[PDB]
Amino acid sequence: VALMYQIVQFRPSATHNLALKDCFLFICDLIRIYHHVLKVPIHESNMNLHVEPQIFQYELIDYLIISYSFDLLEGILRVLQSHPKQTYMEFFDENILKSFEFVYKLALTISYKPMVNVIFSAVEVVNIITSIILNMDNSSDLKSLISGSWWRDCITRLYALLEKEIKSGDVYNENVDTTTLHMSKYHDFFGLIRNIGDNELGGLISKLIYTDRLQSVPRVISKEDIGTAPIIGYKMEKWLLKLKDEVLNIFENLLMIYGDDATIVNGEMLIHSSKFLSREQALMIERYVGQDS
Amino acid sequence: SDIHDVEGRTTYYEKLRVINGISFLIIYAPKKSIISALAQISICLQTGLGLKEVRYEAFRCWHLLVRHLNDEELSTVIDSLIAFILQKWSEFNGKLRNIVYSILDTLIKEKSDLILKLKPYTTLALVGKPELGILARDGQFARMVNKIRSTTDLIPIFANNLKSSNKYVINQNLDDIEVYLRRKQTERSIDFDITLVLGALLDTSHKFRNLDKDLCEKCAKCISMIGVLDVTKHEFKRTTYSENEVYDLNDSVQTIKFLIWVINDILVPAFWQSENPSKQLFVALVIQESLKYCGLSSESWDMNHKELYPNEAKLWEKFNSVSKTTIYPLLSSLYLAQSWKEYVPLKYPSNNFEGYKIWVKRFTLDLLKTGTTENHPLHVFSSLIRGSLSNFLLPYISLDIIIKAPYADILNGIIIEFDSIFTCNLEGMNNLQVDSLRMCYESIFRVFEYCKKWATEFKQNYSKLHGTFIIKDTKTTNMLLRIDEFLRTTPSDLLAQRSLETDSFERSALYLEQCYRQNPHDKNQNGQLLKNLQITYEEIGDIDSLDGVLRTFATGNLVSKIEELQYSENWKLAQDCFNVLGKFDPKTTTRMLKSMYDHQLYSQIISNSSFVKEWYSIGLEAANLEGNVQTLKNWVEQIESLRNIDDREVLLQYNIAKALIAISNEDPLRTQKYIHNSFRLIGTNFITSSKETTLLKKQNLLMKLHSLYDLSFLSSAKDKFEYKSNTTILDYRMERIGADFVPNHYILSMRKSFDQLKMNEQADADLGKTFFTLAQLARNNARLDIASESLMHCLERRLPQAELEFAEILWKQGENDRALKIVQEIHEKYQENSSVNARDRAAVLLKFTEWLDLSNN
């Protein structure tokens, strides 16, 4: 999958035409064969004790394929966005977009454990299309496939996002969700497009490959030894905070396009905007200013 | 109800209001009404005391009662008061802490007796905690602490606390007993009745088996402080359940002792502890209806002998004097007799639903032929509350019907019984069938078990009236008594229990033998039955009957005759035989490894056939115990990636191995994580249920559970003069295991496996001691093959005795002279050295010359 990414982007030009499409439906399907990574339950059974081999290398292959997929998604669109004026209308069809909902709608959960590596790339799609929609005219062929039920759903699931306050020092710790976006230590690695977190395990991915025997099965890393300064707290914090400087720029697009007729703006984001607006104005002033961060 | 309300209206503010009232009520009230519902307040208050911010005024309410309630009371309550405040201590901040000191200083001065006498366990724990300063601050009375400590013996108390279910006090007691035993082995005071606690500990772990893993661990750690206990001396435990055949019918005098035996036993301890608020209304009535014989107060309150009966246990006296005047009828019921369901009817829903229900709905039998005058007829009001307690009264009622020897009531029983006996079995749904049917059986047999106990005394009673055997009515009873065994239909009930094979094995054996023994005798009857006994006697765990039985009938193929040879002290020939079939077959390779390991050949199965998940538990076990660090990593590296395990057994064996390695890396922190991690498993999935009769059946469990603590305790040594001083404790400790071999071998070998891996100079000088200790076992344990290797392997240290010790082991071997020449040479070797002990100069020459005669003239 990684090696396929290096293929997709090389010198995009007009080279890729539909080759993106057939690539997309595949990967958008492949991500569907893998559920049990992203659908894990939030709470662990008291009567589930932890005594087992505690092997990390069958997780690490579960995560890589999830993550690397969600970049290749973004890798596609960013490439498609490099193609001429009206060439865009070729690609999009009810086939491609319906398939996508079950990806995005799978990523952000609210019933299940979050995963912070996809959330970025899960959004950037929702961004990039709404950035391209305005550009080239005749909106998604007059929004041939965009359903108010579909669309508004994709937005009503962001309102849950904005409301998580990302306290800079609780990042890496474990706790309940909807508190904050934690980004646990077990999966942090650079992905592809952007280097998201300090990837303490960035160097383990070469420790599972043996390097002599030519083997199919991994070399058995151990969960005990994976992962003294706080400062890497700030970075992952800051680099996380941009995400909320993104979901904003989702909105301005959303206001430009639809001209308020549909039920999207009638949902009164001023309810959720202001409720966010007022908050920071409370916390920034009280508990932060002066602490040199 | 309020505090426990479903919170449709919520509003905990009422809970604050409630404590006000029952703070007020005690302020002004009559002493009996001060007692009254005291069982309820303590519950209803401590369920308040456990909730978040309401905890404050809770303690406020308590300092009230402590001041004036009763001096003779403040037993049944202070318990849940002390255990709580010791566990939550971290949560009490500034203020709540203060009020506690206001209670204790009163408890000091207000009661100078209770804690010192009526509840002696209280004072030790709170003093035991150094952080509260009750020993440090406050009174000088610690001289009373020192006085009371040595006097009282704590062992019986721990058996008493652990029986209750309150998740704090049960967590407390385990914390003390731990800190208790650790102090003992340092001063090694008592060698021991320490068995009672070991009986109780193993009960809790089986109760919490599903719930609260992290406590259920700590319950396992503590019995590892014990370590095997040497079955040979005190088997302890007990026989079986409680039936108490008191012959309730007539004999007014004998009826009574039953009645009081019920109230202070299955009634008060049922009503006192359990929380079922509305049920508590019904319990008193039958207590009243029981006390209805003693009911009139002045009869019980004035005349000397008009009562004269104890009538209560010391604890049971609490609810005794409260309700003597009460008599709450509460008998209103709508169409109980017209609701009668008969003839296997409910049995449909039983198998449909059940364990509880089939017996619960069997209250239809209760309310039918019961609840008329007599004595126990009031008990209809008990099951009216409806329930595992019904099971207790189940036989007693089930007796009454066919005791009468009007008619149709009796035959209506068997209709469900045969429906219970023959369910057609093969039940597609296991979850219900596995669960209820066992209880049904266990309830079914309970009557049969009772009748035998019953009819035995029933005639033995009138055996004091003699007349040989002469009775008119007991006939129809006896005719009906064995007729209750006609529903057994011989083999039907035999196979009822044979197709069930409930965890009660000896009963599973009896009938299984019974049918096989007399009636059929037919060829195929001996075909299937015999094969069952082997499985049966296997599980009882005494290999004798297993041998003798498998010898006689036997037959089948001559391969079996070759298998049996193990037990006969011939196995060295039989074990040589299986290695053949192994090198050549799914269950073959298992039988090989099982035998070899069973006779304690460890050095074999590591190196033999194991270079299929049934073998790993055996394989990974040996290599763990052998202890080469290099061969061991290979296992773990093979175990770790299966992408699953889901075996209870290897997970225990792995987690020990993944510890030992961490010793070789000098990581005492890490090796704690795994050794503890072993306990949660050993004390959850592998703990048996309670009794299970014989203690020797356990040795395989405890022996694995004793060595652990050593491996944790040695690896907790700091350096040098702690280490060397440490092993002496572990040395002495080994004495309590007895002289038996396989319990000892597995333990002492696991010390070798450790004592190599460390590889520091101090580890060495002990490693030469361990072997030579293992030599002295194998020799007088009647195995010279284990000995020579070991003794051979310590010859690198070339100890002065290592030579002679060989000359020992050979002189048991048939070849006399080749031995004798050694001490012939050694004795003259030390001559003119003019050194060493001159006491050691004796030791050789003793063994020398006594050879020189019996050997040759």
SS3 string, B524-563, reads HHHHHHHHHHHHHHHHHCCHHHHHHHHHHCCCCCHHHHHH
Which residues make Cβ contacts (< 8 Å) with residue A266, sequence separation at least 6?
Answer: A260
Surface-to-core class of residue B402, CB atoms within 10 Å of its CB (0-12 exposed, 13-18 middle, 19+ buried): buried
**Residues of B in Cβ contact (< 8 Å) with A58:** 641, 643
Which residues make Cβ contacts (< 8 Å) with residue A210, sequence separation at least 6?
Answer: A219
CA dist B125 and B177 (Å) reads 10
Cβ(B282)–Cβ(B317) below 8 Å: no
Dmax (CA) for chain B in angstroms is 107
Nearest to B695 by CA among B240, B228, B223: B228
Cβ(A110)–Cβ(A157) below 8 Å: yes
Experimental technique of record: cryo-EM
Query: Resolution of this PDB entry, in A?
Result: 3.9
Contact check, Cβ <8 Å, A47/B651: no
Which residues make Cβ contacts (< 8 Å) with residue B404, sequence separation at least 6?
Answer: B410
What separation in angstroms does the CA of B6 have from each of B3, B9, B10, B58? 9, 8, 8, 21
Length of chain B: 857
The shortest CB-CB distance from A51 to any of B637, B655, B670 is to: B655
Q: What is the DSSP letter of B298?
A: H
If you write DSSP's letter for every residue of chain A in order, what string do you get?
-HHHHHHHTSS-TTT-SSHHHHHHHHHHHHHHH--TTTT--SS--TT----S--B-HHHHHHHHHHHHHHHHHHHHHHHHTTS-TTTHHHH--HHHHHHHHHHHHHHS-SSS---HHHHHHHHHHHHHHHHHHHSSSSHHHHHTT--HHHHHHHHHTTHHHHT----TTSSSS---TTT-----SSS----SSS--S--TTTTGGGTSS-SSS--SS----BTTS----STHHHHHHHHHHGGGGTHHHHHHHHHHHHTT-SHHHHT-HHHHHHHHHHHHHHHIIIIITTS--
B639 touches chain A (CB under 8 A): yes
Q: What is the CA radius of gyration of chain B?
A: 33
Nearest to B392 by CA among B401, B383, B404, B381: B383
Count of Cβ atoms closer than 10 Å to residue A191 Cβ:
22
Contact check, Cβ <8 Å, A58/B641: yes
Distance from CA of B344 to the nearest CA of A (A): 38
Cβ(A70)–Cβ(A187) below 8 Å: no
The shortest CB-CB distance from A58 to any of B643, B654, B678 is to: B643
Tokens of B208: 């919490």
Angle in degrees, CA B586, B589, B592, rounded to 5: 145
**Residues of A in Cβ contact (< 8 Å) with B684:** 49
Contact check, Cβ <8 Å, B651/A52: yes
The shortest CB-CB distance from A47 to any of B210, B639, B678 is to: B210
Mark residue A221 as left, alpha or beta (left: phi above 0; alpha: psi -120 to 50; beta: remaining).
beta
Q: What is the 3-state secondary structure (H, E, C) of B13-33?
A: HHHHHHHHHHHHHHHCCCHHH
Surface-to-core class of residue B593, CB atoms within 10 Å of its CB (0-12 exposed, 13-18 middle, 19+ buried): buried
Nearest to B516 by CA among B482, B552, B484: B552
In the beta sheet, which residues pair with residue A222? A55
**Residues of B in Cβ contact (< 8 Å) with A52:** 645, 651
Cβ(B672)–Cβ(B655) below 8 Å: no
Count of Cβ atoms closer than 10 Å to residue B482 Cβ:
12
Cβ(B565)–Cβ(B595) below 8 Å: no
Distance from CA of B212 to the nearest CA of A (A): 7
User: What is the Cβ-side half-sphere exposure of residue B796, based on CA atoms within 13 angstroms?
Assistant: 9
Cβ(B262)–Cβ(B290) below 8 Å: yes
B646 touches chain A (CB under 8 A): no
CA dist B280 and B283 (Å) reads 5
Surface-to-core class of residue B796, CB atoms within 10 Å of its CB (0-12 exposed, 13-18 middle, 19+ buried): exposed
Q: Which amino acid is at B43?
A: I
Cβ(A220)–Cβ(A146) below 8 Å: no
Which residues make Cβ contacts (< 8 Å) with residue B589, sequence separation at least 6?
Answer: B582, B609, B615
Cβ(B574)–Cβ(B562) below 8 Å: yes
Contact check, Cβ <8 Å, A52/B681: no
B651 touches chain A (CB under 8 A): yes
Tokens of B481: 């008594």
Contact check, Cβ <8 Å, A51/B677: yes
Nearest to B495 by CA among B421, B562, B560, B444: B421
Residue whose pair of structure tokens reads 């009574």 in the numeric block: B256
B653 touches chain A (CB under 8 A): no
Cβ(B284)–Cβ(B272) below 8 Å: no
Distance from CA of A224 to the nearest CA of B (A): 9
Cβ(B493)–Cβ(B487) below 8 Å: yes
User: What is the Cβ-side half-sphere exposure of residue A88, based on CA atoms within 13 angstroms?
Assistant: 22
CA dist B366 and B280 (Å) reads 20
Nearest to B254 by CA among B481, B461, B463, B471: B461
Distance from CA of B629 to the nearest CA of A (A): 18
CA dist B641 and B585 (Å) reads 26
What separation in angstroms does the CA of A93 have from each of A32, A89, A90, A100? 19, 8, 8, 11
CA dist B727 and B769 (Å) reads 12
Surface-to-core class of residue B214, CB atoms within 10 Å of its CB (0-12 exposed, 13-18 middle, 19+ buried): exposed
Cβ(B324)–Cβ(B297) below 8 Å: yes
Give phi and psi for B100, each to the nearest 5.
-60, -45
What separation in angstroms does the CA of B117 have from each of B6, B68, B154, B496? 42, 19, 13, 53
Give phi and psi for B434, each to the nearest 5.
-60, -40
Nearest to B493 by CA among B521, B517, B514: B514
Give phi and psi for A196, each to the nearest 5.
-85, -40
The shortest CB-CB distance from B213 to any of A49, A55, A220 is to: A49
Cβ(A19)–Cβ(A185) below 8 Å: no
**Residues of B in Cβ contact (< 8 Å) with A220:** 637, 640-641
B482 touches chain A (CB under 8 A): no
Tokens of B407: 């008619």
The shortest CB-CB distance from B639 to any of A46, A53, A58 is to: A53
CA dist B557 and B554 (Å) reads 9
